[PDB]
Design an enzyme around this catalytic site. Structure first.
Site, PDB file in Angstrom:
ATOM      1  N   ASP A  36      -9.088  -5.669  11.028  1.00 18.32           N
ATOM      2  CA  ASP A  36      -7.795  -5.029  10.878  1.00 18.32           C
ATOM      3  C   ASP A  36      -7.032  -4.960  12.190  1.00 18.32           C
ATOM      4  O   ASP A  36      -7.300  -4.092  13.014  1.00 18.32           O
ATOM      5  CB  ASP A  36      -8.000  -3.613  10.342  1.00 18.32           C
ATOM      6  CG  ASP A  36      -6.696  -2.926  10.020  1.00 18.32           C
ATOM      7  OD1 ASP A  36      -6.035  -3.389   9.075  1.00 18.32           O
ATOM      8  OD2 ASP A  36      -6.330  -1.942  10.704  1.00 18.32           O
ATOM      9  N   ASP A 232      -0.544  -7.715  10.951  1.00 14.94           N
ATOM     10  CA  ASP A 232      -1.681  -6.954  10.489  1.00 14.94           C
ATOM     11  C   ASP A 232      -2.570  -7.634   9.449  1.00 14.94           C
ATOM     12  O   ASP A 232      -2.193  -7.787   8.293  1.00 14.94           O
ATOM     13  CB  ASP A 232      -1.161  -5.627   9.957  1.00 14.94           C
ATOM     14  CG  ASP A 232      -2.259  -4.704   9.551  1.00 14.94           C
ATOM     15  OD1 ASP A 232      -3.304  -4.703  10.226  1.00 14.94           O
ATOM     16  OD2 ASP A 232      -2.067  -3.970   8.570  1.00 14.94           O
TER      17      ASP A 232
HETATM   18  C1  LIG Z   1      -8.117  -0.941   5.155  1.00 18.88           C
HETATM   19  C2  LIG Z   1      -6.665  -0.447   5.170  1.00 18.88           C
HETATM   20  C3  LIG Z   1      -6.653   0.986   4.630  1.00 18.88           C
HETATM   21  C4  LIG Z   1      -6.034  -0.536   6.606  1.00 18.88           C
HETATM   22  C5  LIG Z   1      -4.469  -0.413   6.696  1.00 18.88           C
HETATM   23  N1  LIG Z   1      -3.953  -1.070   5.484  1.00 18.88           N
HETATM   24  C6  LIG Z   1      -3.029  -0.563   4.642  1.00 18.88           C
HETATM   25  O1  LIG Z   1      -2.504   0.553   4.828  1.00 18.88           O
HETATM   26  C7  LIG Z   1      -2.722  -1.407   3.451  1.00 18.88           C
HETATM   27  C8  LIG Z   1      -3.722  -2.195   2.857  1.00 18.88           C
HETATM   28  C9  LIG Z   1      -3.509  -2.990   1.733  1.00 18.88           C
HETATM   29  C10 LIG Z   1      -4.618  -3.798   1.141  1.00 18.88           C
HETATM   30  O2  LIG Z   1      -4.798  -3.871  -0.087  1.00 18.88           O
HETATM   31  N2  LIG Z   1      -5.430  -4.427   2.011  1.00 18.88           N
HETATM   32  C11 LIG Z   1      -6.575  -5.250   1.629  1.00 18.88           C
HETATM   33  C12 LIG Z   1      -7.785  -4.609   2.334  1.00 18.88           C
HETATM   34  C13 LIG Z   1      -6.356  -6.744   1.958  1.00 18.88           C
HETATM   35  C14 LIG Z   1      -5.986  -7.188   3.258  1.00 18.88           C
HETATM   36  C15 LIG Z   1      -5.800  -8.569   3.510  1.00 18.88           C
HETATM   37  C16 LIG Z   1      -5.979  -9.515   2.465  1.00 18.88           C
HETATM   38  C17 LIG Z   1      -6.344  -9.084   1.167  1.00 18.88           C
HETATM   39  C18 LIG Z   1      -6.532  -7.706   0.915  1.00 18.88           C
HETATM   40  C19 LIG Z   1      -2.210  -2.996   1.163  1.00 18.88           C
HETATM   41  C20 LIG Z   1      -1.145  -2.216   1.722  1.00 18.88           C
HETATM   42  N3  LIG Z   1       0.200  -2.214   1.101  1.00 18.88           N
HETATM   43  C21 LIG Z   1       1.350  -1.603   1.849  1.00 18.88           C
HETATM   44  S1  LIG Z   1       0.698  -3.779   0.427  1.00 18.88           S
HETATM   45  C22 LIG Z   1       0.354  -3.791  -1.315  1.00 18.88           C
HETATM   46  O3  LIG Z   1       0.051  -5.033   1.123  1.00 18.88           O
HETATM   47  O4  LIG Z   1       2.253  -3.971   0.574  1.00 18.88           O
HETATM   48  C23 LIG Z   1      -1.439  -1.422   2.876  1.00 18.88           C
HETATM   49  C24 LIG Z   1      -3.861  -0.982   8.008  1.00 18.88           C
HETATM   50  O5  LIG Z   1      -4.084  -2.375   8.115  1.00 18.88           O
HETATM   51  C25 LIG Z   1      -2.336  -0.775   8.080  1.00 18.88           C
HETATM   52  C26 LIG Z   1      -1.800  -0.307   9.439  1.00 18.88           C
HETATM   53  C27 LIG Z   1      -0.321  -0.774   9.580  1.00 18.88           C
HETATM   54  C28 LIG Z   1      -1.903   1.246   9.600  1.00 18.88           C
HETATM   55  O6  LIG Z   1      -1.698   2.011   8.654  1.00 18.88           O
HETATM   56  N4  LIG Z   1      -2.204   1.699  10.827  1.00 18.88           N
HETATM   57  C29 LIG Z   1      -2.301   3.145  11.145  1.00 18.88           C
HETATM   58  C30 LIG Z   1      -0.833   3.722  11.034  1.00 18.88           C
HETATM   59  O7  LIG Z   1       0.142   3.107  11.498  1.00 18.88           O
HETATM   60  N5  LIG Z   1      -0.714   4.891  10.391  1.00 18.88           N
HETATM   61  C31 LIG Z   1       0.558   5.583  10.161  1.00 18.88           C
HETATM   62  C32 LIG Z   1       0.395   7.004  10.692  1.00 18.88           C
HETATM   63  C33 LIG Z   1       0.827   5.581   8.655  1.00 18.88           C
HETATM   64  C34 LIG Z   1      -3.031   3.334  12.532  1.00 18.88           C
HETATM   65  C35 LIG Z   1      -2.296   2.719  13.750  1.00 18.88           C
HETATM   66  C36 LIG Z   1      -3.244   4.827  12.866  1.00 18.88           C
END
Ligand SMILES: CC(C)C[C@H](NC(=O)c1cc(C(=O)N[C@H](C)c2ccccc2)cc(N(C)S(C)(=O)=O)c1)[C@@H](O)C[C@@H](C)C(=O)N[C@H](C(=O)NC(C)C)C(C)C
Length: 389
Positions: A36, A232
């Site tokens: 990630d 990402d």
């Molecule tokens: C493991 C995740 C839980 C990690 C986070 N993934 C998400 O949140 C997220 C995952 C998936 C999802 O299905 N991924 C699968 C595994 C996947 C991934 C790749 C290929 C196939 C499947 C969809 C979405 N949707 C929006 S979509 C529908 O694609 O439009 C979002 C991170 O990669 C994201 C990252 C930007 C952040 O959230 N970082 C944090 C962040 O800033 N948080 C703020 C406070 C919100 C960190 C810096 C603290």
């Protein structure tokens, strides 16, 4: 650049995220970790859970260190709470090394673990800056670089399939390559174009122009990076700021108008289906993103096909029928270049030279008439105005 040992070390070709095998503790406990680049926390399940086939058992590691401190991490989709501590980590199909890294033992989680994904942890590869609790928590890659001679950069080739793979297929098939410390020329064709990492927190970049089948979306570039634009691996979709999203879908809708789709589809909710092998790939436009280059007033563009933004989903009624989901969605937190993009290219995270490079992936899905692309240079000016402050 020949790290043929790390080549093909990823998994989840057509699953819920790309993971790599890692081991933590002494003796080595094996765990599959989601790559990630959108976060900076190294976390693993540490207690039984419904969607967990296995987890981290601290009491069994002789090298474990309890920092007696909790941590909370919120993602766009999902979150977890845990207990901070450090332990020894290894990547069997990565460089032959061992490093003591910070590890968050996940005890409480919500909509984080994806049932069937087959990964029990997450490897946040971004920068300390966005690490939780604060930037004092050295991220994994940083530990790796400080504790060894491994070069300060890594490469990612995420392999989509174009067709849905069942449970046992995602298991017994390369999902891609994560080359730690170098580049493998076999993972890409053509040239590598580098765009500058604007600021070292997320892997932030700047988009200077967007095109739908060559047609300029013609919007103030600041909109394309409204708030920010990051790369990402942990995000599925090409996420776009509300305004840009509305415009793109309008244009995509216009380019494919010879066929009508239910509103839900454009929302990424309901899947569209066609007779096996009749997907009209040609009616859908290619999408190009122009990124700023290292050379001033110069930029390049990466182009994807509908085979990257129309995700394959197994149809309920097994029908040979090929089904897809529109994987371009709205964002209130900036542009997110997820797997929809990354699956088209070989991406180099040159942390050392503070830059990110793209090249056509040697494993991207396409047809006989079109292919993903990476080309430059283009003479566009005052591109500093694209960044959001
Ligand atoms: C493991 C995740 C839980 C990690 C986070 N993934 C998400 O949140 C997220 C995952 C998936 C999802 O299905 N991924 C699968 C595994 C996947 C991934 C790749 C290929 C196939 C499947 C969809 C979405 N949707 C929006 S979509 C529908 O694609 O439009 C979002 C991170 O990669 C994201 C990252 C930007 C952040 O959230 N970082 C944090 C962040 O800033 N948080 C703020 C406070 C919100 C960190 C810096 C603290």
């Amino acid at each position: 650049g020949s790290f043929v040992e790390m080549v093909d070390n990823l998994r989840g070709k057509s699953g819920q995220g790309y993971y790599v095998e890692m081991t933590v503790g002494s003796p080595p406990q094996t765990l599959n970790i989601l790559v990630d680049t959108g976060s900076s926390n190294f976390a693993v399940g540490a207690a039984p859970h419904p969607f967990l086939h296995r987890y981290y058992q601290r009491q069994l590691s002789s090298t474990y260190r309890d920092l007696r401190k909790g941590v909370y991490v919120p993602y766009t989709q999902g979150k977890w709470e845990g207990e901070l501590g450090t332990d020894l980590v290894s990547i069997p199909h990565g460089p032959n090394v061992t490093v003591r890294a910070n590890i968050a033992a996940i005890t409480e989680s919500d909509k984080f673990f994806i049932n069937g994904s087959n990964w029990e942890g997450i490897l946040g590869l971004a920068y300390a800056e966005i690490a939780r609790p604060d930037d004092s928590l050295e991220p994994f890659f940083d530990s790796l670089v400080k504790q060894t001679h491994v070069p300060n950069l890594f490469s990612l080739q995420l392999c989509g399939a174009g067709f849905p793979l069942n449970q046992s297929e995602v298991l017994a098939s390369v999902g891609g390559s994560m080359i730690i410390g170098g580049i493998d020329h076999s993972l890409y064709t053509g040239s590598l174009w580098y765009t500058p990492i604007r600021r070292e927190w997320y892997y932030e970049v700047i988009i200077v122009r967007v095109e739908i089948n060559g047609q300029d979306l013609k919007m103030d570039c600041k909109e394309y990076n409204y708030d920010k634009s990051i790369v990402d691996s942990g995000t599925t979709n090409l996420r776009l700021p509300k305004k840009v999203f509305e415009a793109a879908v309008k244009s995509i809708k216009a380019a494919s108008s010879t066929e009508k789709f239910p509103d839900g589809f454009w929302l990424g909710e309901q899947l569209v289906c066609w007779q096996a092998g009749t997907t009209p790939w040609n009616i859908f436009p290619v999408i190009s993103l122009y990124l700023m280059g290292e050379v001033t007033n110069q930029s390049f563009r990466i182009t994807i096909l509908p085979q990257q933004y129309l995700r394959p989903v197994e149809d309920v009624a097994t029908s040979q029928d090929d089904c897809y989901k529109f994987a371009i969605s709205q964002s209130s937190t900036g542009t997110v270049m997820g797997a929809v993009i990354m699956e088209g290219f070989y991406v180099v995270f040159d942390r050392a030279r503070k830059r990110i490079g793209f090249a056509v992936s040697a494993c991207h899905v396409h047809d006989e008439f079109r292919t993903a692309a990476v080309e430059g240079p283009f003479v566009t000016l005052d591109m500093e105005d694209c960044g959001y402050n």
